[PDB]
Structure formats: structure tokens, C-alpha cells
Amino acid sequence: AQRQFFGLTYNFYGQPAPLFDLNDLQELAGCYARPWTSRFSHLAISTGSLPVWSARYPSVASRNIIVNTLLGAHLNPFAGGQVTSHQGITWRDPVLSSLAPVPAIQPPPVWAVAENVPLDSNNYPTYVLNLSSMWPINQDVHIMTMWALSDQGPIYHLEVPVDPMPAATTAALMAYIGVPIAHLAQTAYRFAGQLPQSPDSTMVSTIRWLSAIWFGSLTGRLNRSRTCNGFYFEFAKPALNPDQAVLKWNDGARAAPPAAAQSSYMRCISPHWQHQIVEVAGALMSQSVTAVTGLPALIDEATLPAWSQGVANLTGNGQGVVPCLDYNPVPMAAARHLQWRQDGLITAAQEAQLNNDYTAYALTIERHLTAMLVANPIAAGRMPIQPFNAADFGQAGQTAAAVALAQAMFV
Amino acid sequence: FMAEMNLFNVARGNLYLVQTATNGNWSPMAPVAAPPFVRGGPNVRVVGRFGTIVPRPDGLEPQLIDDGNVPRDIAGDWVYPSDVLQVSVAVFCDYVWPMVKAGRTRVLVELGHYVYTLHYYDPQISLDEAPILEEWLSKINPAGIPPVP
Amino acid sequence: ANLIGGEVSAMVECMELCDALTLHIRETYVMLLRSMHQDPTQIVQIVNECANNLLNSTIPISLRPTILCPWFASSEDLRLQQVMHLVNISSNTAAALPL
Amino acid sequence: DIITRPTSDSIAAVANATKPAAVVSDPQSMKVTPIVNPSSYVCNVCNARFSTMSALSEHLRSDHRDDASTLLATPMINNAIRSFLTAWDGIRILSPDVS
Amino acid sequence: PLRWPGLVDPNYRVGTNDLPNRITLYNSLYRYNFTYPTLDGIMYVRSAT
Amino acid sequence: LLDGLALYGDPRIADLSAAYLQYGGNVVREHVPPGPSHIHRTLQQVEST
Known about the structure:
This is part of a larger assembly, with one copy of chain A and five copies of chain B. Chain A has helices at 22-26, 62-72, 77-80, 126-129, 131-148, 167-173, 181-194, 202-218, 277-293, 329-342, 348-375, 399-409, and strands at 6-8, 45-46, 89-91, 99-101, 118-120, 155-160, 231-234, 246-249, 262-268, 298-300, 315-316, 321-322, 324-327. Chain A is of the alpha/beta class. In chain A, the strands form five sheets. In chain A, strands 6-9-13 form a three-stranded mixed beta sheet. In chain A, helix 7 (181-194) packs parallel to helix 9 (277-293), helix 8 (202-218) packs antiparallel against helix 9 (277-293) and helix 10 (329-342) runs antiparallel to helix 11 (348-375). The longest helix of chain A has 28 residues, at 348-375. The radius of gyration of chain A is 21 Å and the shape is globular. By secondary structure, chain B is α/β, with parallel strands linked by helices. Chain B has helices spanning 82-101, 130-138, and strands at 10-12, 15-17, 44-46, 53-54, 63-65, 71-73, 76-81, 105-110, 113-115. In chain B, the strands form three sheets. In chain B, strands 2-8-7-3 form a four-stranded mixed beta sheet. A three-stranded antiparallel beta sheet of chain B has the order 4-5-6, with no helix packed on it. In chain B, strand 7 (76-81), helix 1 (82-101) and strand 8 form a beta-alpha-beta unit. The longest helix of chain B is centred in the middle third of the chain and has 20 residues, at 82-101. In chain B, 19% of the residues are buried. The chains are: A alpha/beta, B alpha/beta. At the B-C interface, strand 4 of B face loops of C. Chain C: It is found in: Virion. Chain C: Homodecamer; each decamer is made up of two conformers of VP2, called VP2A and VP2B. 12 homodecamers assemble to form an icosahedral capsid. Interacts with VP6. Chain C: Belongs to the turreted BTV-fold inner capsid family.
């Protein structure tokens, strides 16, 4: 199994301190005051389809964002090799089971506030010794890093090999017929969460294909007329249940494998993701695979924000550097609808209607978020939602390249 | 009659429910200060037409569905049309009412006119008004309601 | 061990005395069942819609990795089923009256 | 055990001399009723009422057990719906057949 | 050995088999542990007005 | 379950269809091709091997 990881903390948006408060530290959905394996605890039991959010957690991404900011203040051991304390709170034990107020016996040194500190697991030898019990830290730290590197939306990775889907994976895949994407993401998070896993594994390869398949369906390139290996993702009408996309298996035609191996990094270029569940699910699912297998290659710095330029083990501009594409959901939906009518699943009249419906739906997301931002100014002290500008809702990004990749990916 | 209805044991206007622990005088039928959180005020929520409630897992406390068909946090100010109460008194009695007794929330019951009734007490000895209200809640059903005490 | 439900894994991958043919049958049967799987969370919406929004309902449920609710059927199955009804009735049309 | 040498009498007498009551009967009491009703107990997932904490604890220990309980095959499989509760009057309806 | 590739072959992929031509006796498979939920719900009626 | 196919008519079925005839000579026919079967696939595999 993988024995070392690297990471990076969040970036203060001009504020002088990490953006969270003690109550946030007191109201995590998981076990008391522990951030590990908690990113889904707030929806383990569910009823209905309504998104879950609250006054001080007003967006679907809000809880994860807070958790990420929270971790930024306490990950010193992977930078300075020592446990520290911040505002009188530190870990219970070197295993980092949970956080607790500092005891008045051997108080650890006070943490020095900083941002965007690179992380290396080798700075903290006890992690290697207690790997069997500290394994979930690997996943969560990787997830935090994958979000910290972007100013606009989490980064994740796609790839498809030249060989057809191996039989063993197909056996594992069929267990997940007819389950929505959000549930799958929750399952994927749990898998890579509890115990250490070898990078080579049927389950690992299985999830990797799932990530690829969903993207192929997201562009509409994969549909019930053109399956990956019989598999594809079904979609409901965006006017109602716009997010209940589920996995389906079918006996129809299959797309031929690509000419060469395809792989790229992906990102959402518009603030819509902060309140749209499927983006979070897809990102987390892909990130889960990269967590256990590590990063296949460095990411291209070219399109990333300033603080992400040239991170030691994360970003680069050399030869073996995978580029990163970004897209906007609204044009993506337009492309997906266009594929459907070209493949003949719908008539042009419907395609016009679908675009109108989705655009109206997306507008509410923007309207909700923009109103929510002013209700939670970043200068207050905590950052429930990531800041943005109004123009960010109109950026097309590299969406055209994105669909081109999918067409080159499934062919 | 519309000007002298009080003489027929009928009152007009809405009803408030706020935990108040007074030591001096008290006059519920003739308030002196302006009522708080009039409908449409800031952070004032009106219940949904079904009065349904939704649970949450692992520490997260339940939420209430407003007219906008959106779950909302129970704490704060809320407005109950009488009809919604008449069909959801049970869930109200089980979730909202305890928060009221904790003084963490305030409720306005909307009802144009109603029959009221009075209960006098000695201001010297101790008293708690909660049981009377809890009894009054227990007798509400979809059909009708008892007079307001 | 993967997807441990506290004490026990949700599914395991093992090698043992087993012939391919029987295995092929068993796997397809699983695929059939999963094809019938229904997401439980959607039930409340199904109820509310079927009630013409005269009822509003809540049904909490825990989401475990391996969870099976074989309740779904495509429109094709129902349409085929309807046609089958006509065929079985064909000898005596009067048998439809109890409906 | 550990020794418990009794103290001197005079000290005991002095201590026992100064012992005000803990609770008194004062009309003025600013009494306050319990926040949560202690007379009934409800199942937080199915809203079944109960008379005692023990009864409620067992009900969830039976009706709401999400255990992957048995490595042996389950003797039965239940239908989708087990019961419903009508909020407006607190009447529980049982499926005519869940098994 | 032809009927036991999954047991005595160093070049044996997981789950593969030549089913149409012959039957192998030792193979890799998945054993499942599905769960079968039951539903208890609460329904609310719409208010008069 | 399937008896009508055997008891009445010709069992040599191809693809079921129902239709109604309008007095204007127009015919409205609705085919019901079955969805993807699973048992049929593995059965054909069993025959082949």
C-alpha cells in the first residue's frame, strides 16, 4: 500500500487567520470533534431529495469547506514534525484521534499562523508506524489539497486505458446498478477511508472506471444508445430531480476503446458547484481514487491561481505534466442535449426546452449563492462559502475542449 | 358588535407565545409594548402549508418546512396559521413547544378572532403557566379548538 | 477488508473451488436483481406525486453500501404485462368484469 | 479495605451543630416545569409512543436495528412498507402484509 | 492442468476464463452481503386554507 | 403466468403487438418488444458451451 503522501493547506483570502470558529469545531457531524471520515456524516441517514443545509452551513459544499479550513490550522506535524496547539486546542494523542482542549501538564508549543504550507508525511515518523490506524488521514489530507489548489472549484483526475474494461471490474461493477451518483460517492469515500489499500486492487480500478463513465455520460457522449461496456448514467428531466442521475446497464452498442491512453485533470470553472451536489459527488469520487493511488503526474500550473504556481509535489510546467481542463455546467448541459438529439434520443423541439429549463434552474443556484455570500461576509471570521464575483457565473472556460476530450475518450 | 365584541367573550387579533419570567405586573389582555416580530419582519418564518418536519442524522437537529418548501432551523421566530396547527399539533407539541419553553424561539399564532377565557391567580405564591397551555394544546384537533386561556 | 459494516465487510473477493458455468449463472442473477433495484429515497416523492400532492410524507432510511430494494420495473415490462393480460383473458372476455 | 479511624467527638459535635437544611418549603419558588415532557417517550424514527425509557429502548433495539446481523441466510424478506403514522391524529397503520 | 488455470498458472488474470471452449473448476468470485431495508413513514395532510 | 400462449392460438410467437381498427380505415398498432433480458443471455451461453 501507499506509504507516503504530500499536501498543501488552504489560502487565506487576505484575512490574517484561518476562517473558522470554535463552534464549527464543536458541531461536526461525525464523532465529537474529529474531522476524519466525516465528510458524509451529515447525510448518512436521509429522507427525500432536498439538499441539506442550515443557517451557518448554507451550501452543500459549506461543511467540507469549513472542515478544510479547520484542518489548515492543525496539520503542523506534517510540516514541522511536531504537534502544536491553536487557541488552546490540540490533538488528544499522537495518533490524532480527535481534538481537545490543551491539558495543563505538558502544553505543546503554540502554532505559528501561516498559509499554504506544503505537507510531507515523512516529517512525522509515527504515522508510518501507526499506518493501520492513521490511514483515513491520508484520504482527507489529499482531499483538502485537491480543493486548496483551486480558487474556483475542486480539481480531480480522469483517465481511460487502451484496453477494454477488465472482466474482474465488470464483476464488481454490477453490484452498483440503479444507484444514484451521490450514494456512489458516499460509498467511494467510505472505501478508501477505513483501512489501507493497495494501489492495485479490483475495487480501486472499479471506482476509476466509474469516474470516467460518469464524465462520459455528463457530456452526453455516453448514453443508452452508446454504452461504455453496457454501463451508462441515466438522467431525469432538469425541471425536477435535476440531480438524480443513476447508473444503468444495457445490452446496446458499446463505444470502441480510444486510440491511445487518455488522461487529464478536471475542474469546475463557475461558482455553481458550491450548491450543486453532483459536482461535489463527482469530484470526491475521483479524488478518492487519487488518494489511494497518489497523483499519477504533476498538474499544469498555467491555468491555476497564484498561490498554486509551482507547488513542490503538486504542480509543475515540465514535460510529464498533465494539463487541466475546466468547464461551466450550463454550456455543458447544452452540449449534452445536443448529443442526445444527434444520437436521436430527443427531437430538436425538446432540446430547446431542456436548455431553457436548465438555464432557469442554474439561475436559481446563482441567485441563491450570491444572496448567501452577503449574508456571510468573509471578514466575519469564518468562510462557509468561497468568495466569487458576479462575472464568474458567465465564464465558459475550456468547456469546448472538455467535450472534445470525452469524444476522444469514448469512441 | 364589531366594536364591543369583548363583552361577548370574543377577542380579535393574533396570539403570541414567548417565555416571559416577570416579577412585577402582568397584563396579557392589554399589552403596553409593541408586539415583536410582526409578520414579514426580518428573520421571521411562516410554516409550510403541511406543517411537516424533517429529521437529520448524527447530531444535526431537525428542521421545519416553511411556505417556500424549504427546511429551516427551528430556533428563531415562527408564524403558525391556525389551520396548520390544527393538523400538526402533535409534531408541534413534540419539537417546537420544548424550544419555546427553553426561550430559544418565539411563535405567533395567526387567528383572526377567537373565544378567550381567563384564569386568575394569587400574585404572591409561585406559578408556572406551562401546564395550562400544554393541556390546551392537547385538546386541539382538525375539527376545532378550545377557547384561548 | 472493505466497506466494513462495523464488524463485517459488505462484499469480498475470494478464490475457491468453483466452476465457471455456475458462476456465470450466479453473476447474471445478481445483475438481474440489481437491475430491479430502486433508490429508496425517491419513495416519498413517488407517494407525494401519486397522492396528487394531497399528502406530504417523510421516510427516513440509513444508506449502507450494499442495499437492495428490488421494486422498480421499466415501462416496457408493464406494457408487455398488459398485453399478456389480454392474451390470458382471450378465451373468456367476461373474466375481466371483477376489475 | 482502608482504615476509617473516626474523628474526635468535639469536632463532630461542632460540625453537626452547623447543618442548615438543604431544601425548604418556600411559597415563592420561581418554579419551572421540565423542558421536555417526561410522561411519554417517542421513537425518534417511527414516533411510536411509550410509557417508559426501558420500553422505548427495546423497541429501537428491535424495530430499528440496522445490523448486518447474520452471516447465515435470512429466513425471510419483508416488503417495502411496514407501517405508516398519520400525524394529524397519531394513528399508526400497518401494512396488510409486509412478509 | 487445463481445467485448473486459476490454480496452477502464473499468468492467470483474475476472473478470466475460456467459458465457450471448456469448463474450469477453480475460479475467483465475489460473495455479497446485501441488506434488505423496510420502511416506516409519517404522512401529513394539507391544511384547510 | 404464460398459459394463454400455449392454451390458445399459435405458440410460435415472434413479437407481441396490439392494435385497434378505426372505421376510417386507419390502423393504430403498438408493438411491445421486450427489454433487455438477462436469463436469455446466460442460457445461450450455456447452450454454446
